[PDB]
Design a binder for this molecule. Sequence first.
Ligand SMILES: Cc1cccc(-c2cn(CC[C@H](N)Cc3cc(F)c(F)cc3F)nn2)c1
Ligand SMILES: Cc1cccc(-c2cn(CC[C@H](N)Cc3cc(F)c(F)cc3F)nn2)c1
Lengths: 724, 724
Amino acid sequence: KTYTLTDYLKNTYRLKLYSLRWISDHEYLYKQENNILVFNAEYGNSSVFLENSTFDEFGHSINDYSISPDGQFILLEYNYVKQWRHSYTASYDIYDLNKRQLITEERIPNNTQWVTWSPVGHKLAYVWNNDIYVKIEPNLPSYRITWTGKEDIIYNGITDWVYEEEVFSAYSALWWSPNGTFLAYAQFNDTEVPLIEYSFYSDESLQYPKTVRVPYPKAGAVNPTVKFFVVNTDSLSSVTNATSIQITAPASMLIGDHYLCDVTWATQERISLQWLRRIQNYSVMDICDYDESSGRWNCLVARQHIEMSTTGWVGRFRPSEPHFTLDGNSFYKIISNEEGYRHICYFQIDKKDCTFITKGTWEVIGIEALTSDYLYYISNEYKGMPGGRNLYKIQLSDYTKVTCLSCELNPERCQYYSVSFSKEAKYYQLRCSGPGLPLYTLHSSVNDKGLRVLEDNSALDKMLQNVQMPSKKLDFIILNETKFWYQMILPPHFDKSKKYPLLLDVYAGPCSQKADTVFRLNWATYLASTENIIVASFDGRGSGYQGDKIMHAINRRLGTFEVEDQIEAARQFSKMGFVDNKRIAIWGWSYGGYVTSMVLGSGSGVFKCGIAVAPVSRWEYYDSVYTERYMGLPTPEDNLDHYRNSTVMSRAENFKQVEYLLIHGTADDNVHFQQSAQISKALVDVGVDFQAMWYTDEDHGIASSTAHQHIYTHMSHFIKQCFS
Amino acid sequence: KTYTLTDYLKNTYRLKLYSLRWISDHEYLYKQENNILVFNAEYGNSSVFLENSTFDEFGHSINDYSISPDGQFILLEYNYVKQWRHSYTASYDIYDLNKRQLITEERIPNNTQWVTWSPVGHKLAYVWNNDIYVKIEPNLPSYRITWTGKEDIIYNGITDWVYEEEVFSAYSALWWSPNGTFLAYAQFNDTEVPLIEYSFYSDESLQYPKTVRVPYPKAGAVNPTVKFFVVNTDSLSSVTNATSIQITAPASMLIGDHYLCDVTWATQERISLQWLRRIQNYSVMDICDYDESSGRWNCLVARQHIEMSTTGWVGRFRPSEPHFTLDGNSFYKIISNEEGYRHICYFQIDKKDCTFITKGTWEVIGIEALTSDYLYYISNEYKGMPGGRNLYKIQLSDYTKVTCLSCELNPERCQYYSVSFSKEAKYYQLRCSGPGLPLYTLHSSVNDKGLRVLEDNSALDKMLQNVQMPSKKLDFIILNETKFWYQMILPPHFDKSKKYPLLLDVYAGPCSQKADTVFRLNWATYLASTENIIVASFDGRGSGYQGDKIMHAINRRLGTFEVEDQIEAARQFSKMGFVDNKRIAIWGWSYGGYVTSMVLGSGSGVFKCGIAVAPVSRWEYYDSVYTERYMGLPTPEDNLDHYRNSTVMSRAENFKQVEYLLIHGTADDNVHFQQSAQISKALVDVGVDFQAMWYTDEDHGIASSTAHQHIYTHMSHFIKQCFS
Ligand SMILES: Cc1cccc(-c2cn(CC[C@H](N)Cc3cc(F)c(F)cc3F)nn2)c1
Ligand SMILES: Cc1cccc(-c2cn(CC[C@H](N)Cc3cc(F)c(F)cc3F)nn2)c1
């Protein structure tokens, strides 16, 4: 027997996670059956912290919970209702743990946009009708910090669409100070930002389709504007509209259009900000101190740091976040060095220069933890593989004393690690994601002994010995004087002498990685396992984690190299001779659907067919923060030329040579139906036949249970047919 | 060689028309090459009336012309820009024929909604920004009759969406009196009518899709309201806002929601109106006289005639129009008699009863002309075939003296006639549409001698002897004690002993006729001629021209009998044994996409596959005037039950048994994309795979040159594949 489509769609073979949240420097919470336990890492003893039956009469299905850091209250999120990618609304009840009662006085209102405890104690900040509210005690009246909030226009403590998706990667635009004194929050004015309008159809009952209106800046459109504020949460008059002290931006930003692009507190009275120019090659960091006499905030022009690039844009998707030392007089931050590799730079608050505390022909991925002794960072250094991911520690007193904590823990089973440290970094969890089965283990920082194995998925391991799994090959090939990685999913019993049909699975977007050591059970597993199809991927130019020379190659050039390298990557898989070069296909979502579409439109004749799911078809239709970061402005002085030269529509003719399946969700707020509807029109105009499928009311994920099954079923038929 | 798809899509074999407009009782205008001639029917001589080169320096491509009845001016329509089905906007220049100059003073404004001469002389009424304007002389200032016009809200002299499509079948809501004294006009208030909102995507250039908003009453929603007015076009103060004398409705109408449903002038000072209840089983005619002393209008309660039905709705799609005798004291009107057959009733203005001047088991189609001696009517009496159409005359002095003027003119070539009479009915054109090649001939009423053959399409006839045409069989079958007509397009050399694959071509709507004697060169021609496929059609219950017993069968029952009869019709075609009963398909547009969808969802297992093009999926989504005319109100007291029991969505499951192609234009204002999008969602919910195709910016006709070709190409592959 074999890994079938239903196996994938019905999820018959489960991967197991181990999901914990650290509540102290030695205690974390795990959920079990329905009980919330608390595992003491020190001894190993675990205690029922909350019992499955504690909420049987609660009367509502509970979507999420949040426990106040001081263990005194638990937040109960129910009535969840997704909005965009990270945003949603909900209702909230607070339960008193000291007692055993749900607070009925001054409750958090229905339809709340965001909720959060202070990092210490049990204060609540919560946004509602676009306005911030603070609650020092669960049962007491709430101090309404903001008054200006207005639907689709003013955003207080929450991001508008473009800031949510493309900048902060969350819905929440607020930030407590490390002890809970100050509530930093940002403000978004969307007044002159244009609306995207699309239909929502709803239940068959709904007689007129709703029109959905979203402030969405397409490329070169009018952006939102931001203002930043800080509030003292202590001095809160039960009888005066609280004073929000605005920090303004540097004057190098205030000349032109800008985005606030990071908010990191350093100390109890020192906050750092990072600003980005609308042209995203120039960033500025500010450090703002609290002047205890004036109640104001002061950002010294001598404490400013500038980050800029000449070969492309600043950061991977934004500038990295700083990691301040206990005192808050120095920080660590990832930057690309002179050779273009993202490493750790050591900064003194008021010194313009930094010191690199790593270098190499590889990249730091992220700074994970910082003690007085150690900085922990994840990097793809080990075995020189960029698809890999490991935990290291560097000695703060000695920059040449680097230990790899994970490299050797299980060499064969484990090459992709992520880490979760406890408060003050006493203990850490290591998550292994491949190439073997996921493996979750606990560790103490002190001497690095492996206390316990929390999850090894042996349960699944048993189940899979009965199933003909595909194998995964990860390797590289040299194109110029650069090595480019690829990965194949090989059908079980892979006979290198036969000729297999290949499916080129595509993303390709700037700073992507589709070739890694991760263990996945997805659609490709089924395509190899059962249909004996090689599903390949290739991280050519534009892609991440291999230094700026590669990643910035597509600067102001989207839809060129990344596209051509994908074709090349296919030519080469044919030169390996286990590939039926008359049955090569291509497929992709989001950016990858664009690249898929661009490829079929190239008339390279390498490819028989392709599926583009929710593709971008023309950069001008995509949002500004993303598009511009790579292409600049679409005016004839900036880059309007490459904008006009890189559409799927102009390659319409060549589709005559291919079989094409274009699939789009009608209620995609992210890559709007328009992109796909302009392609279809284009093809129809030049008399190209193709295949289409819309998905009513689906968004960019086409992720509803039934549509997920439908789309994948539909694509399989398409692929099968295409390949006989 | 054979009739191929391209032959149909590139229109290589042309049918020729003969398009003339009568300007007198003996002269008509024909266009030739680019010259407008005038053929005198009296002698036969023809003269250049306007020369092809008269407008070479005109500077604009001329979409249409209109010549004033008194030969003095010609109206020049250019910059045409389609709106809905009949509606559009344009610009207009007026050219003086007496002289040779384009009037430059007081020109008709850009973006005019409607324009028309008075029936006599050369006055102009023209609607613009929703308001009426009169012009007694081309060069003189225009008297603005209305002031209340407002976009999407107030319609003066033009119909709103639902009145255009479903009532008057034109854009123009105005009516001159027979000599040009009075301008009758209607007014539409759409204030509380709900909007349909859909996207338009436009040229690739357009960066945000436009949202299109249209006042559109779905079933049971708030209807537009109407008021009627008459103006004296002579007494027009170059210094006073002209007085519009409102006629109001009967009081039997004013109790509830109503529509104005006909406007026929009787004499120079007597206008007739017809009113319809929102429940469309009750009509009332009014006759309104001009009181020369009061300047008012008076509709005598004794001159009212009531039209109503108990077994269904009044009229075929509306009540028929009256035909008033010279004096205006009697009129002729078509009504169904006691046995349910539409015949001519003779009415005296103030007498409640009428006299039937025809009876039979067949129907009058329309009253074409009326003299002091004769009434001319078209009917399907000849050979007892309802798919036929003939010209007859009845003697006004003797109701038993009926002559058929066409029946015998060419029995084999000619069984479908239409007629165009000259002023006072001195001469007429006969248009033969099948079953042979279209034949256009001229005739004098006086003794009925056939002056000349104007067009015989012998040019095409030559061309087609070289091509393997399909033959067409029209016949009937008995189901209960009723005979139901069907037609087959049979592949050339049709061997009755073989087993052919059949495609059931569906419309099926209330009062439809898909089985007739007409000669067509369409898609079916290609399917039979080249793919040797039988393309059948069948007019079962609900269908027109065979009396109320059949047509009213579906009253309050849409999506039942008409649907079941179509399945039946296919069972029976299998019993004829030349049909491969494992390769039967079904297809349909508009209503027929609905019926096609209902059938596949019936699980009758007769049908392998089907194509539904722009179907209705649920009656509550279609406009009110149509839907209600057949189903009543969708409230639980009226008919909400049949409404909820007749959706395509509830048959979702059964689609498992079929192969389905659903095709819809995104910018369909008539059957909104919602209808299709609710189907696709329904199918995806029960995990049925199917095939889809949207058409960017196309409407209900998918009729742009490139989309037309694309859709039909696409459906062919589908059909071919479905049939191997
Ligand atoms: C692994 C990792 C870590 C942190 C940030 C990110 C990340 C990923 N992204 C992508 C955001 C962007 N909206 C993706 C996107 C690209 C398209 F081209 C498109 F059409 C739609 C998209 F959502 N931004 N930041 C990824
Ligand atoms: C031959 C002839 C003479 C006069 C009027 C008409 C006539 C034809 N029609 C059809 C109009 C109707 N809206 C068609 C239609 C039906 C549907 F069910 C639908 F979903 C969409 C449509 F356009 N109404 N009146 C036909």
